[PDB]
mmCIF file of N, CA and C and ligand atoms in Angstrom:
data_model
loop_
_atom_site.group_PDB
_atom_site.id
_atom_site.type_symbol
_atom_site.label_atom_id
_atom_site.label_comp_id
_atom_site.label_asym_id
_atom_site.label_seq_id
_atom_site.Cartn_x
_atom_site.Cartn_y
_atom_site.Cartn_z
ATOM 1 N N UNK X 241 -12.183 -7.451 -29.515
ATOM 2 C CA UNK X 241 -11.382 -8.281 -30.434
ATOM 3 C C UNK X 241 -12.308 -9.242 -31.158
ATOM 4 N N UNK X 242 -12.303 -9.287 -32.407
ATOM 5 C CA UNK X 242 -13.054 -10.039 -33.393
ATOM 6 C C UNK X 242 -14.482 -9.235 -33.833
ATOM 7 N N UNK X 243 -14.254 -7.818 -33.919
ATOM 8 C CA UNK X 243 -15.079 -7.027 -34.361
ATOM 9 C C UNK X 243 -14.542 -7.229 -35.863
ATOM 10 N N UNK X 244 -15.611 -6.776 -36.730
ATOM 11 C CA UNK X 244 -15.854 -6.587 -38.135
ATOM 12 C C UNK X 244 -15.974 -5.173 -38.583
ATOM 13 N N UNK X 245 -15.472 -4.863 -39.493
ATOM 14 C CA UNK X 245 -15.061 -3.969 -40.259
ATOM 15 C C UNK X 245 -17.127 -3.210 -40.957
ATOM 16 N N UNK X 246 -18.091 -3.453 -39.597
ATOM 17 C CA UNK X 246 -19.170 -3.133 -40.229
ATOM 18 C C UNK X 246 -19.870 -3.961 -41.136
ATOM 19 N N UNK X 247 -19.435 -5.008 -41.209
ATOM 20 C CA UNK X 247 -20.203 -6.779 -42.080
ATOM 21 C C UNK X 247 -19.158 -7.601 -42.321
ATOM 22 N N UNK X 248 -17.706 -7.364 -42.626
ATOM 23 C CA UNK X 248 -16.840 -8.572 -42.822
ATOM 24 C C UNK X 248 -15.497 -8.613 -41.658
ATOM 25 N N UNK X 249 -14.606 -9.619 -42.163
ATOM 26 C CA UNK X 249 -13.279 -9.671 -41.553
ATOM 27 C C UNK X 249 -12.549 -10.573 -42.370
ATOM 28 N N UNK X 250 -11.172 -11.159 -42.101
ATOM 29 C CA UNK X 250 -10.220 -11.575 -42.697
ATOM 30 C C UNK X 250 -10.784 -12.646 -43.352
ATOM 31 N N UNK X 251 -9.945 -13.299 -44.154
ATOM 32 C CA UNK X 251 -10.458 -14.484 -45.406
ATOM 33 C C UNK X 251 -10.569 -15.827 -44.576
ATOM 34 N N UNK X 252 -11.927 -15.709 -44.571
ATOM 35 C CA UNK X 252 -12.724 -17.086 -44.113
ATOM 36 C C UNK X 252 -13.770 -16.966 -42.718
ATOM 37 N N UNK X 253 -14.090 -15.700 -41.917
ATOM 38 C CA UNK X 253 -14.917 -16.048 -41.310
ATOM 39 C C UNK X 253 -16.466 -15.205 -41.853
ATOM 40 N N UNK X 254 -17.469 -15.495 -40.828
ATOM 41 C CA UNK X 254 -18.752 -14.610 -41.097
ATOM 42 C C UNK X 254 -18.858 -13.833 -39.738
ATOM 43 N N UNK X 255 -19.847 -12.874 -40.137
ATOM 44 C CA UNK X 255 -20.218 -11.666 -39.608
ATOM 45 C C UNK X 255 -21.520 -11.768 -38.712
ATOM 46 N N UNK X 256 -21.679 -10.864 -37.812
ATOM 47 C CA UNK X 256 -23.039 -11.113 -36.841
ATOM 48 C C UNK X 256 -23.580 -9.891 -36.510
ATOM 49 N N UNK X 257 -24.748 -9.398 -35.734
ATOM 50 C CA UNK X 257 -25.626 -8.442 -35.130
ATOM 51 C C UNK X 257 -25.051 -7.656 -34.486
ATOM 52 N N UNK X 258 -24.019 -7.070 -33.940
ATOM 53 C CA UNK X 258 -22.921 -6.520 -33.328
ATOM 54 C C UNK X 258 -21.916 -6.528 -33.945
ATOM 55 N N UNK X 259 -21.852 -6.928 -35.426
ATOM 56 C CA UNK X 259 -20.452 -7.233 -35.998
ATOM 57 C C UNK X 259 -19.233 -7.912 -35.499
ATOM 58 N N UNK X 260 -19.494 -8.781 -34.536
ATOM 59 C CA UNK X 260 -18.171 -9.549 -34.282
ATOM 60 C C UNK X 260 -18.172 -10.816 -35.359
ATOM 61 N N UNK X 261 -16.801 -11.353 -35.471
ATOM 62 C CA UNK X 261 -16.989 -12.696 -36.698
ATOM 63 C C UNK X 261 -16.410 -13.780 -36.349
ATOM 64 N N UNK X 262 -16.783 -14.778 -37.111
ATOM 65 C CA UNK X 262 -16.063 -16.164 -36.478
ATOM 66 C C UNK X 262 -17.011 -17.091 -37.645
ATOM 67 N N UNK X 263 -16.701 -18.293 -37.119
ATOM 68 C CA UNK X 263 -17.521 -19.471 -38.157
ATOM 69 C C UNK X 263 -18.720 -20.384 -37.037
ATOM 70 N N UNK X 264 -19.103 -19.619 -36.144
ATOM 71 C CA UNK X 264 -20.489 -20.330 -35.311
ATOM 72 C C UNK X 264 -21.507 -19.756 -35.570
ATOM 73 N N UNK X 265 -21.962 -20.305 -34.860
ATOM 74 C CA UNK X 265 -23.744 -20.032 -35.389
ATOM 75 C C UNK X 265 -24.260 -18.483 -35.566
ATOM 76 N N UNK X 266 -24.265 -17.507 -34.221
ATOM 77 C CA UNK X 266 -24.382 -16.467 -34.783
ATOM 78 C C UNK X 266 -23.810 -15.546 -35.802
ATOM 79 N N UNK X 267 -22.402 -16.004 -36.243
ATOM 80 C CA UNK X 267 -21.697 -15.635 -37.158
ATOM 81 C C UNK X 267 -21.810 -15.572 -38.118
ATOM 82 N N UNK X 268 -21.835 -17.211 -38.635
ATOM 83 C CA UNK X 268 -21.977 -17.404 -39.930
ATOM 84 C C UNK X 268 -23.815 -18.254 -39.692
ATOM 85 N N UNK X 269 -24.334 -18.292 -39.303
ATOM 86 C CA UNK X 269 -25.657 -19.142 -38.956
ATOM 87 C C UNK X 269 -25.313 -20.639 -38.881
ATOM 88 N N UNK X 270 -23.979 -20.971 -38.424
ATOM 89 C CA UNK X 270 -23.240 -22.203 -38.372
ATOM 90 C C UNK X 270 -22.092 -22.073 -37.913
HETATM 91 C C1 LIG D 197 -32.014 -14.080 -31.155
HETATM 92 C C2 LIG D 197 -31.179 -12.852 -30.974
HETATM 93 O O1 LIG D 197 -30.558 -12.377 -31.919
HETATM 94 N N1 LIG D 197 -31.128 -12.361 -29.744
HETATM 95 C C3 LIG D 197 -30.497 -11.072 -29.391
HETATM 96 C C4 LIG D 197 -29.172 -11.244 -28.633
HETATM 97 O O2 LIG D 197 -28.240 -11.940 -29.433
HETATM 98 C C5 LIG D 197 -28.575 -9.872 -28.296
HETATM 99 O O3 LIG D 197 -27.354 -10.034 -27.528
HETATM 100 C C6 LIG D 197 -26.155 -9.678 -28.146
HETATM 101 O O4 LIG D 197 -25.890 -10.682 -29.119
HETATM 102 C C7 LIG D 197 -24.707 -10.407 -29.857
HETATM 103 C C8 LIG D 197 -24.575 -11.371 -31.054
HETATM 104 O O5 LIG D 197 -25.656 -11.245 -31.964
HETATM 105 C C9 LIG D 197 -23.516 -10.565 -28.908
HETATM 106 O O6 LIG D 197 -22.279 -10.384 -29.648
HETATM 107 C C10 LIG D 197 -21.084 -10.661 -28.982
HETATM 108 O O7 LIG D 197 -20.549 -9.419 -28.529
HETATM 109 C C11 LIG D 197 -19.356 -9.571 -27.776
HETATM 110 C C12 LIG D 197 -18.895 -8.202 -27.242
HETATM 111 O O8 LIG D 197 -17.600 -8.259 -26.657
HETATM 112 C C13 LIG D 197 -18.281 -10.164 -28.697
HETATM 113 O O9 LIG D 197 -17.025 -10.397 -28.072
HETATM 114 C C14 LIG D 197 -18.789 -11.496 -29.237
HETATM 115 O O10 LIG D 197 -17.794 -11.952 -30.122
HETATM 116 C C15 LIG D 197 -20.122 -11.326 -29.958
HETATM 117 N N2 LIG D 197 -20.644 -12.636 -30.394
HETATM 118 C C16 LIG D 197 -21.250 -12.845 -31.549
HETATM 119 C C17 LIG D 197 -21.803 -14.219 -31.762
HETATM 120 O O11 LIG D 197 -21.387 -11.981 -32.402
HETATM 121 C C18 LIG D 197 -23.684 -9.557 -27.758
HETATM 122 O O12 LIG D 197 -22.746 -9.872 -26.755
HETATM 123 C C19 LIG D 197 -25.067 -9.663 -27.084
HETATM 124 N N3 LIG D 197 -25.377 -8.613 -26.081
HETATM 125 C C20 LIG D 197 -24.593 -7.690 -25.530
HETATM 126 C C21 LIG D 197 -25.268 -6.775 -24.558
HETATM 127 O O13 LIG D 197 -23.399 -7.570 -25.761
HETATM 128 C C22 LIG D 197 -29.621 -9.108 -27.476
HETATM 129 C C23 LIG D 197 -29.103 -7.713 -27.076
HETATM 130 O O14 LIG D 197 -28.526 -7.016 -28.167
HETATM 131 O O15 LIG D 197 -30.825 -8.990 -28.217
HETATM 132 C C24 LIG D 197 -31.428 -10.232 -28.526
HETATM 133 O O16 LIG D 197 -32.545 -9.890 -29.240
#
């Protein structure tokens, strides 16, 4: 849960090395 579509996800988070997303550091580099 909170895998990425291969680089993105829903409107407003970022993407990571495994493609999971969110707005922390490995995510978004913040
Ligand atoms: C400096 C660096 O990049 N070090 C590498 C480690 O980060 C890496 O471990 C894996 O890191 C990723 C994130 O980049 C982890 O992702 C998490 O994956 C779980 C899976 O269920 C997911 O739920 C999390 O949301 C997701 N988090 C993020 C922030 O994306 C992943 O768990 C780590 N390792 C494993 C085995 O799952 C290691 C190994 O790949 O290498 C370092 O070089």
């Amino acid at each position: 849960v909170g895998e990425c579509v291969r680089g993105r996800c829903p409107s407003g988070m970022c993407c990571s090395q495994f493609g999971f997303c969110g707005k922390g550091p490995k995510y978004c580099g913040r």
